[PDB]
């Protein structure tokens with residue numbers, strides 16, 4: 001008897017406004033892992049006890065301590081923006097919030113030091129669609145929908161601003177937390193099912209629509225730390241903001257930061273505005289200091305890209321709901 005009224009929540013940890021991670025349990029008894037819940041990918045993976053370099057810094061899964069483990073052994077390679085991971089498939093019981101699902105995940109044996117020694121999380125829970133899943137492995141949310149236990153076939157994200165004994169964030173499975181948003185949701189449908197990507201009708205700097213006038217794509221990526229666009233777009237945008245290209249990021253003089261113009265994204269006939277307080281890492285106010293912007297360039301290869309990606313920078317401002325039943329994304333202002 002699976003009566004659909006569940007709304008299981010996961011408390012997230014905010015690390016530097018770049019990494020938001022919660023706790024999952026794998027096995028019988030459960031082995032806990034710090035995971036990033038990523039709408040940009042669809043595979044679940046944790047480091048393996050069978051791991052031979054970043055592995056030393058993370059919690060490892062030992063199949064030999066799980067009574068519910070079922071072998072598979074299929075080799076698997078998962079490629080992200082900063083680096084690639086490698087391992088094999090295994091099956092066990094995964095606990096997320098108060099939900100228990102039999103999930104096929106990847107035990108990772110090859111995990112490079114760069115970028116994984118910078119990661120504060122052990123693994124990744126992909127919140128994308130089977131269409132994006134490596135080796136056509138059923139994603140965890142698809143398996144939760146199959147249980148027929150949720151209030152609604154939706155999940156929502158809340159990413160807070162770094163503070164202190166405060167909530168870093170929160171994923172709700174089955175609904176949305178009204179304590180974390182103001183007013184009502186505005187929905188935008190997905191271009192196609194299979195990707196958490198919507199149409200964008202322009203990017204503005206101040207009150208002038210500078211970019212994406214003839215339309216472009218926007219990927220709603222909980223796994224991305226920043227807002228990203230193509231090199232072309234980010235060059236135009238940063239020139240408008242008067243930001244200079246440093247080696248890995250764009251900076252402005254720290255004094256110039258509070259006077260930077262609003263950046264607006266046109267999504268579903270509504271403008272979603274980020275003020276300077278939302279995209280500048282205001283670490284100092286000095287003229288002698290350089291301050292980083294929470295916006296970078298990233299070229300996403302086809303079929304997904306070229307696209308913009310609305311990461312933690314966007315999500316922190318706008319509470320996000322991902323609707324599987326209706327294939328649409330909802331934004332309400334975060335609280």
Ligand SMILES: O=C(NCC1c2ccccc2Oc2ccccc21)[C@H]1CCCNC1
Pocket residue numbers: 019036038039040041080081082083115116118119124221223224225
């Ligand atoms: O690579 C991504 N995000 C970066 C973020 C990350 C998210 C998911 C998987 C691996 C991963 O690597 C690191 C390592 C250190 C710090 C942050 C990250 C994107 C790639 C496309 C799908 N979403 C996540």
Ligand SMILES: *[C@@H]1O[C@H](CO)[C@@H](O)[C@H](O)[C@H]1NC(C)=O
Pocket residue numbers: 071072073074089135136137
């Ligand atoms: C591993 O899992 C796949 C499903 O992705 C299945 O088709 C395959 O037969 C399994 N292989 C083994 C060795 O159990």
